[PDB]
Symmetry: C3
Subunit: 40 residues, 3 copies
Amino acid sequence: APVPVTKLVCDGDTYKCTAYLDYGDGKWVAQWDTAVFHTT
Amino acid sequence: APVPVTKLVCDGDTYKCTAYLDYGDGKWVAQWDTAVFHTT
Amino acid sequence: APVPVTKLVCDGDTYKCTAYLDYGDGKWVAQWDTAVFHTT
């Protein structure tokens, strides 16, 4: 079932965005590649 | 146009992360697969 | 290294979700396609 995100971090070095779910104790985390770049 | 997210949920059972946009009334929602696992 | 998201926007017209990282000054931003639709 859907669970609100307590914390959401991202990494540009690997383009991998991690997430912290509140499912259970809070150890489970999601990860999905995401393009990154600088914006003017 | 870009719209701030009022609510952001995720599902590990299906690896599908849902989102709630503030565009219009607030019925529109995004969805994108995302790997999930336990972290020590 | 992981960095908390200060702002998170999304676009349904292009299905592209943008993000604002706190890495450095705060110019860097992530982007990843995401399906969108209406929910009843």
